[PDB]
A paper describes a structure:
At gene promoters, RNA polymerase II (Pol II) assembles into a preinitiation complex (PIC) which includes the coactivator Mediator. Here, we describe the PIC-Mediator complex from yeast at unprecedented resolution and provide a reference structure for initiation complexes. Moreover, we observe three Mediator-bound fragments of the C-terminal domain (CTD) of Pol II which stabilize Mediator conformation within the PIC and significantly extend prior information from the human system. We reveal two stretches of the CTD bound between the Mediator head and middle modules, as well as one CTD stretch at the Mediator hook domain.
Here, we report the high-resolution structure of the yeast PIC-core Mediator complex that we could stabilize by addition of the +1 nucleosome. We therefore prepared a 16-subunit core Mediator complex (cMed) and bound it to a preassembled yeast PIC that was extended by a +1 nucleosome as recently reported. We obtained a stable PIC-cMed-nucleosome complex that was suited for structural analysis. Single-particle cryo-electron microscopy (cryo-EM) analysis led to reconstructions of the PIC-cMed complex lacking the nucleosome and the PIC-cMed-nucleosome complex at 3.0 Å and 3.6 Å resolution, respectively. In the nucleosome-containing PIC-cMed structure, the nucleosome was oriented as observed before in a PIC-nucleosome complex lacking cMed and did not contact Mediator. Therefore, we did not obtain additional insights into the interactions of the nucleosome with the PIC compared to what was previously described, and do not describe the nucleosome further here.
Residue numbers in the entry:
A (entry chain F): 12 to 35, 62 to 155
B (entry chain J): 1 to 69
C (entry chain e): 1 to 112, 159 to 302
D (entry chain B): 785 to 1224
E (entry chain K): 1 to 115
F (entry chain f): 2 to 190, 194 to 210
G (entry chain C): 3 to 268
H (entry chain L): 26 to 70
Write the structure that this text describes.
């Protein structure tokens, strides 16, 4: 065992403190074709979020690292993430984002039409 | 435990000066500063090697040897 | 570091000339008679070695082999001077009788000054990846140009490396440099021993279709040569069966 | 300590009694058995490598024995008689007749199964060889034969540790069973990451080590053994550290021991007068020169000896990494502890930080592909994991539902599977389904 | 455990050269020279004595990390003056100065008769 | 012809150009630069008996068409790695594999459990100077710790009058204040390249 | 001659005090650094212990033995062991010493560096002898033995520089000072009431003219006239410390020239 | 067979496997294994 | 590979002077004069080139300095006598004779004048001490 006087705080261990005080629809149904919000009435932002950017870059890099076809010309680029960022720079990623609204409905936004402002 | 060979800071050899330091202490009745200056330790880096040394080896030498020839 | 993509097969002695005609039609090149005396050297058993090497990786003891082209005057039994040196010579070589006895090979090895050129080859076991349809093997090759000194004999030279002589064999065959850089050998194999020569390929020819590629990382080149080898197997399909031999057969490492 | 075979022991090579000393520590025998070294300490922002309680310690001084220490670890082992034939034996095991030998070497052992004192040991090397008999004619691990009449119960060295076998002690316990104790000696040379503290709560680790020619130097050629940062001083209000350095400078020059007892009438002005009498600036500042270029530093540096202690927290006893390793028997998660090649806790509030970052796939990878990824089969009828799967025969069946065509495989943590099976033990059905039933 | 050996502070490893010269694209007629297995001892000397050259517009050295015994020396000269020749002249003048210093120290030490 | 090898063990790093300007009036022309690395392998057998040496010297001339010579107990191994200088018989019969590897790579890759490399002396960026019926090849040798010594290689087309040329080069080396060179002209038994490598071995040993 | 000028103030067996004039600050500091770190010296590098019944640890004794100063006059004539063709060490690249001390006396038996005995063949060189400086003739106190304790070991002394390990340093402490009157204003003096009286004058202030306190600051003046005191450990004489430091710095600069010329012709 | 030393008598003793671990001169039941006869190399840094 | 007409004119003039250099050095090397190509000087005092010819039977580090000067019209050669030494890989004219220099026309140098020059040069070198 060990015997050290340097006090190290036991993390994730609030159960000692817990035990000290123990007493005191209308528009869409099922999974039909109605669930997709059509393109003309999509109400979400046309900007591609930081999470959308991170997951598109990760997915595209995972594909490029698994010998997917690359739709941009390489300038000697080797890292799949940098190839993915070059594809995202000139909008050659053939993916879409299914943005789930809280009621289960979704909008399909293509990566091509989303604006990369960040 | 036993006197270091070299001063830690500068590297002047102080291991040869320990018994002369003890002799300047006990049979010449000098104080420790004049004894250190007599041996040529003029930097306090060298003076603290001999001045602060605790010579624990003879405490280790009071025990009987484990392997006796 | 040459990778050797190779396929192997066997024919009988009776079907030799038909195969020569067939591969002459396929290649467009006439067969060329060739020979090579291969001497295989194992590490010295009296020497205590380490499983590790200079690096911290484990290394198994491997037999290494030297080869050279014996002149064909040493392989004619005073009956075939009139017959020209072509593919018809191998029809006569059926039994164990070869003019190259053990003593002439010892004269070759012990050089009884300067030595003939040799070819030192080190080959590991072929790859175990079961996605390749040809036997892919790695051969570490170098060329011993010459020698000198009081111990210029290649036997003493190989003893200098810590290697002792284990066995040797003589192979005589005909080979075709085909299209797309494919070499197709068709060889007999005799083992040379003190008790007498022994024909390993008894009453038949060992067939070896190999392509040598310099770079093992050129996966495009590897796939190109593999497709060429599978093509050659496809024209020869039905007549002769070419297949990947067992990797345990091509393992030259010393077992213990 | 040489005749004491303690479990752990740390011994400095060159203990130094403090230059600044208390009248009280005479009775504590602190000048007889000291616990530190008077290091020449510069308080300077030298290279930025002593920031945030780091320190720059002289590599040349380290080479000459500054804060070098001995480390002794004793290993205990005994042979115990469980029954008649099931008894342990101190001997050198052989791979021919002993099962589950450790992959570390056994060549350093002798015929008694013990390594001789003086022999250098490396990591995971066997120092005590012990064998226990086993039941004959079994079939375990494939490499089991009738020759293997024993199994290896040997004691290896710690995987990260290495050193010299210092003393091996054979004796019998109270029960009369022979038991051995093996002491291994190694030296901890100070390096980047070793924790050092003064006598004032000013703990710190070595940020970097410079050699003597790169250290700043005074006009006398004195270089520090230790550069600490000025920013450690004002917020902590450790004036006694500065007074210790001044008094130790005066004591080292005058050849005395400074009386640093608390409630005496010893002032900074008297120590400054004594320091000025020795030809130094009275407040301890010295004009030092940059070691890289030789130019005078525009700021003068507080300089002088200070008693520093080497603390027991070495970085090499704390450095730990694991890519893959052993798993626990129960949860099939990575084990705990760097001694057992364990894994690092990815706790609940680390998971909360990854949730706040929005990294869902990294969180999934930590909880599944980094700890415990289990494939289990469930049927579509009942959500329970009671599906008998024969993947070689490609046959699936859930008894009760009696279905063989409605089986799904899912990837859950093994802790989740254990939780669900424990809930089934509590007569609760945690039925898992792969399709929704109600709207959002 | 992770501490590097102390000899590759001054020993060239396998397949590395003492100097390597890369052209610097920020300024015209400027190069960056990486000195392997050196430290501030040579760098400060070369840089401060390159600055005595009237045809050297820029001379600076830096040890990017104390862990690695190397430094980068950037030299920019006037047009028509190759910085390699600036380095040659700088090193040659340092050689001459050190030789004169050595001979002067021999003469002055031989003048001492109390040793 | 015949070759001899002079290795000034202790010369200044600038002795090479000092020796070059010593032969200012004798150089007719300058040919392409040359180089050489000198390797030494120690046998790693735990139990070697007597009457066998543990040292093997690998000498790789970057001139003479990229050729490596191995010396052990006065026995040579002229070994090549270029594809151009393979004999056509060795590549025709399939004994060779088209392109060979350097024997140094074989010893450091597939023979490291017997022989490990100990010392590497890379004498690089040498020069070739042509005297009157003579070829001096100057190079500066380099161990791990910087400079090692000046290496001079003498080569003549003929061999009838060669020792006088050696005496002349020795006199020129004495003229530039270098008296403790280790000359070597010992042959084996006898190729030119193997004898040159043996002369290198005796020059670099003391 | 024209160039750097040296005026030796004090010369001793283990100390030289000289004034280094007509020289740049970089050259003086590089010389100081080379003397501290880059001069080759002989020191015990590997200790093979045969018998050790002392109270000191084996590697304790080995670290003490490495720090023993050994004679290094002919350390040029020795070779680096990594540059030598021998397997571990030989007479061409190492000096083999031995130490066999036994406690046959009733009192404690001190083990000195004078008990180190050279067993290798020096071939007439002047290296390997332990340095004795004190009047008693004993060397550095290596160990102490009570009755019955034995210490039998073999040392191999190899050459190195202080960059590899500080046991190879011959330079002790090197004093170094320029501008003792702060006429260049490279220091801004910390003070409480008056910087002139709170800061003691150095001993080198007597060798320069004090400032006139009314004259303007000389912005054109550079740093020269360096006051250096070199102290020898004992391995080499202190003048040889200075001379070998100048030679080592010269050799480094010549190596830079060599590298530049080799890649110039390629 | 293997050399052992008693804790306080410091007399070298040879013990086989069947022999009980005791000193023939002292009877003190603590014995120390002898130091190895092989030479051990210490790098003096 | 000449882009502009001025570039081709410079290449043509360089070809002219290099042809003169080649014919002179072949003349002297066929005679037996060991002409040197390992020596370069910053300036030997239009576009001009210099030849450093020597015959190894008259004192060391001395050469016959041949300087040609070339133009579109008129091209002559300067016969100078000088002493060149090699110091640390650098060639320096330790002596030059700029006084007794004669400039013969290019269309007049033959093998007979080369014979006369060979019989004269050794005396010229001897008289320069
Ligand atoms: Mg903290
Ligand atoms: Zn000191
Ligand atoms: Zn079910
Ligand atoms: Zn089951
Ligand atoms: Zn040696
Ligand atoms: Zn006893």
């Amino acid at each position: 065992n060990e015997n050290f006087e340097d006090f190290d705080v036991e993390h994730f261990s609030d159960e000692e403190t817990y035990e000290e005080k123990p007493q005191f629809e209308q528009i869409r149904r099922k999974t039909l074709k109605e669930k997709a919000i059509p393109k003309d009435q999509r109400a979400t932002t046309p900007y591609m979020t930081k999470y959308e950017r991170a997951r598109i870059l990760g997915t595209r890099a995972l594909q490029i690292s698994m010998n997917a076809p690359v739709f941009v010309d390489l300038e000697g680029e080797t890292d799949p993430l940098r190839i993915a960022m070059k594809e995202l720079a000139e909008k050659k990623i053939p993916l879409v984002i299914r943005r789930y609204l809280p009621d289960g409905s979704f909008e399909d936004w293509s990566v091509e039409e989303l604006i990369v402002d960040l | 435990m036993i006197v270091p060979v070299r001063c830690f800071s500068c590297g002047k050899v102080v291991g040869d000066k320990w018994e002369s330091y003890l002799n300047l202490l006990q049979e010449d009745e000098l104080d420790e500063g004049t004894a250190l200056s007599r041996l040529g330790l003029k930097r306090y880096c060298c003076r603290r090697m001999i001045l602060t040394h605790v010579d624990l080896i003879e405490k280790f030498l009071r025990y009987n040897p484990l392997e006796k020839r | 570091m040459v990778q050797q993509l190779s396929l192997f097969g066997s024919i009988g002695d009776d079907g030799y000339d038909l195969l020569i005609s067939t591969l002459t039609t396929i290649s467009g090149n006439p067969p060329l008679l060739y020979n090579s005396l291969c001497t295989v050297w194992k590490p010295n058993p009296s020497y205590d070695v380490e499983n590790v090497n200079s690096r911290n990786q484990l290394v198994e003891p491997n037999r290494i082999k030297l080869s050279k082209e014996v002149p064909f005057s040493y392989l004619i039994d005073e009956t075939m001077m009139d017959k020209p040196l072509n593919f018809r010579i191998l029809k006569s070589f059926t039994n164990d009788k070869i003019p190259l006895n053990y003593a002439m090979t010892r004269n070759i090895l012990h050089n009884t000054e300067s030595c003939s050129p040799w070819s030192l080859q080190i080959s590991d076991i072929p790859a175990a990846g079961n996605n390749r349809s040809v036997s892919m093997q790695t051969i570490a090759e170098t060329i011993i140009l010459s020698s000198a000194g009081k111990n210029s004999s290649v036997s003493s030279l190989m003893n200098g490396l810590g290697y002792v002589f284990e066995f040797q064999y003589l192979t005589i065959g005909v080979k075709f440099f085909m299209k797309h850089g494919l070499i197709l050998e068709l060889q007999k194999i005799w083992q040379i021993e003190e008790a007498g020569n022994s024909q390993i390929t008894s009453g038949g020819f060992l067939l070896k279709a190999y392509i040598n590629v310099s770079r093992g990382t050129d996966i495009d080149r590897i796939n190109y040569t593999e497709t060429a080898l599978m093509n050659l197997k496809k024209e020869l399909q039905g007549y002769i069966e070419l297949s990947v031999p067992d990797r345990q057969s091509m393992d030259s490492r010393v077992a213990h | 300590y040489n005749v004491r075979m303690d479990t752990m022991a740390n011994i400095l090579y060159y203990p130094q009694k403090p230059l600044g000393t208390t009248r009280a520590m005479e009775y504590l025998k602190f000048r007889e058995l000291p616990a530190g070294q008077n290091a020449i300490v510069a308080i300077a922002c030298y290279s930025g490598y002593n920031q945030e309680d780091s320190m720059i310690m002289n590599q040349s001084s380290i080479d000459r024995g500054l804060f070098r220490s001995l480390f002794f670890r004793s290993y205990m082992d005994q042979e115990k008689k469980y029954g008649m034939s099931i008894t342990e034996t101190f001997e050198k095991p052989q791979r021919t007749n002993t099962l589950r030998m450790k992959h570390g070497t056994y060549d350093k052992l002798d015929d008694d199964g013990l390594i001789a004192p003086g022999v250098r040991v490396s990591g995971e090397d066997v120092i005590i060889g012990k064998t226990t008999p086993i039941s004959p004619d079994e079939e375990e691990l494939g490499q089991r034969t009738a020759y293997h009449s024993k199994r290896d119960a040997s004691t290896p060295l710690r995987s990260t540790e290495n050193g010299i076998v210092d003393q091996v002690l054979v004796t019998t316990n109270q029960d009369g069973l022979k038991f051995v104790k093996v002491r291994v000696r190694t030296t901890k040379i100070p390096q980047i990451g070793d924790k050092f503290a003064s006598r004032h709560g000013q703990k710190g680790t070595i940020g970097i080590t410079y050699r003597r020619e790169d250290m700043p130097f005074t006009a006398e050629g004195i270089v520090p053994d230790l550069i600490i940062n000025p920013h450690a001083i004002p917020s902590r209000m450790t004036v006694a550290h500065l007074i210790e350095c001044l008094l130790s400078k005066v004591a080292a020059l005058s050849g005395n021991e400074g009386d640093a007892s608390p409630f005496t009438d010893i002032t900074v002005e008297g120590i400054s007068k004594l320091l000025r009498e020795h030809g130094y600036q009275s407040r301890g500042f010295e004009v030092m020169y940059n070691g890289h270029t030789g130019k005078k530093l525009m700021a003068q540096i507080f300089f002088g000896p200070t008693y520093y202690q080497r603390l027991r927290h070495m970085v090499d006893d704390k450095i730990h990494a694991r890519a893959r390793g052993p798993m626990q028997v129960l949860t099939r998660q990575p084990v705990e502890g760097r001694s057992r090649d364990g894994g690092l806790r990815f706790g609940e509030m680390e998971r909360d930080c990854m949730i706040a970052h929005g990294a869902a796939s990294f969180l999934k990878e930590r909880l599944m592909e980094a700890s415990d990824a289990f494939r289990v089969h469930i049927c579509g009828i009942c959500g329970l994991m009671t599906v008998i799967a024969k993947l070689n025969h490609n046959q699936f069946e859930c008894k009760g539902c009696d279905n063989k065509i409605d089986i799904y495989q899912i990837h859950i943590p093994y802790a989740a599977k254990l939780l669900f099976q424990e809930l089934m033990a509590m007569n609760i059905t945690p039925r898992l389904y792969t399709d929704r039933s109600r709207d959002f | 455990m992770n501490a590097p050996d102390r000899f590759e502070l001054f020993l060239l490893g396998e397949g590395e050269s003492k100097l390597k010269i890369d052209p610097d694209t920020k300024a015209p007629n400027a190069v960056v020279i990486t000195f392997e297995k050196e430290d501030h001892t040579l760098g400060n000397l070369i840089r401060a004595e390159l600055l005595n050259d009237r045809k050297v517009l820029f001379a600076a050295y830096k040890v990017e990390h104390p862990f690695f015994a190397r430094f980068k020396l950037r030299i920019q000269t006037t047009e028509g003056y190759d910085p390699k020749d600036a380095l040659k002249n700088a090193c040659n003048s340092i050689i001459n100065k050190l030789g004169a210093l050595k001979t002067n120290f021999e003469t002055e030490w031989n003048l001492q008769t109390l040793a | 012809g015949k070759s001899a090898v002079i290795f000034v063990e202790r010369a200044t790093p600038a002795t090479l150009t000092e020796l070059k300007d010593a032969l200012s009036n004798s150089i007719l022309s300058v040919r392409d630069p040359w180089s050489i690395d000198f390797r030494t392998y120690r046998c790693s057998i735990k139990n070697l008996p007597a009457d066998v040496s543990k040292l093997m010297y690998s000498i790789t001339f970057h001139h003479h068409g990229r050729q490596t010579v191995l010396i052990k107990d006065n026995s040579a191994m002229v070994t090549t790695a270029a594809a151009a200088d393979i004999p056509p018989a060795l590549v025709f019969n399939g004994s060779s594999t088209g392109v060979p590897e350097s024997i140094d790579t074989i010893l450091s890759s597939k023979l490291s459990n017997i022989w490990m490399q100990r010392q590497l002396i890379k004498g690089d960026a040498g020069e070739t100077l042509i005297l009157d019926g003579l070829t001096v090849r100057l190079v500066n040798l380099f161990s791990s710790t910087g400079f090692k010594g000046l290496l001079i290689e003498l080569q003549a087309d003929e061999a009838g009058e060669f020792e006088t040329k050696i005496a002349g080069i020795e006199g020129h080396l004495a003229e530039i204040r270098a008296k403790e060179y280790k000359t070597s002209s010992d042959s084996l038994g006898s190729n030119e390249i193997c004898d040159l490598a043996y002369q290198y071995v005796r020059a670099l040993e003391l | 001659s024209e160039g750097p000028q040296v005026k030796i103030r004090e010369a001793s067996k283990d100390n030289v005090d000289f004034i280094l004039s007509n020289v740049d600050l970089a050259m003086a500091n590089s010389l100081r650094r080379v003397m501290i770190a880059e001069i080759p010296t002989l020191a015990i590098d590997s200790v093979e212990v045969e018998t050790n019944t002392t109270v000191l640890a084996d590697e304790f004794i080995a670290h003490r033995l490495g720090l023993i100063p050994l004679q290094s006059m002919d350390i040029e004539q020795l070779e680096y062991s990594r540059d030598c063709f021998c397997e571990d060490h030989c007479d061409k690249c190492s000096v083999v010493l031995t130490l066999q001390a036994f406690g046959e006396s009733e009192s404690t038996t001190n083990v000195y560096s004078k008990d180190l005995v050279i067993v290798s063949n020096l071939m007439g060189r002047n290296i390997g002898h332990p340095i004795i400086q004190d009047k008693e003739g004993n060397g550095v106190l290596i160990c102490k033995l009570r009755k019955g304790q034995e210490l039998k070991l073999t040392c191999v002394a190899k050459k190195g520089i202080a960059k590899e390990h500080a046991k190879w340093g011959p330079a002790a402490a090197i004093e170094f000072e320029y501008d003792p009157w702060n006429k260049l204003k490279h220091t801004d003096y910390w003070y409480e009431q008056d910087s002139a009286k709170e800061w003691p004058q150095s001993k080198n202030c007597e060798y320069e003219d004090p400032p006139n306190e009314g004259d303007p600051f000389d912005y054109k003046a550079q740093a020269d006239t360096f006051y250096m005191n070199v102290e020898s450990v004992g391995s080499i004489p202190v003048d040889q410390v200075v001379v070998r430091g100048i030679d080592t710095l010269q050799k480094k600069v010549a190596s830079i020239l060599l590298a530049l010329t080799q890649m110039d012709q390629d | 067979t293997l050399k052992y030393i008693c804790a306080e008598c410091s007399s070298k003793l040879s013990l086989s496997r069947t022999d009980a671990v005791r000193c023939k001169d002292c009877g003190h039941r603590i014995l120390l294994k002898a130091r190895t006869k092989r030479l051990v190399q210490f790098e003096a840094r | 590979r000449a882009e502009g007409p001025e570039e081709l004119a410079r290449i043509l003039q360089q070809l002219k002077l290099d042809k003169i250099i080649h014919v002179l050095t072949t003349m002297f090397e066929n005679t037996g004069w060991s002409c040197s190509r390992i020596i370069k000087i910053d300036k030997p005092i239009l576009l001009q080139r210099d030849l450093f010819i020597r015959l190894p039977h008259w004192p060391l580090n001395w050469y016959l300095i041949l300087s040609i000067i070339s133009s579109k019209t008129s091209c002559v050669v300067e016969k100078r006598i000088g002493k060149i030494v090699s110091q640390r890989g650098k060639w320096n004219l330790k002596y030059l004779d700029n006084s007794n220099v004669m400039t013969v026309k290019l269309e007049s140098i033959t093998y007979q004048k080369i014979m006369i020059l060979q019989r004269t040069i050794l005396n010229r070198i001897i008289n320069h001490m």
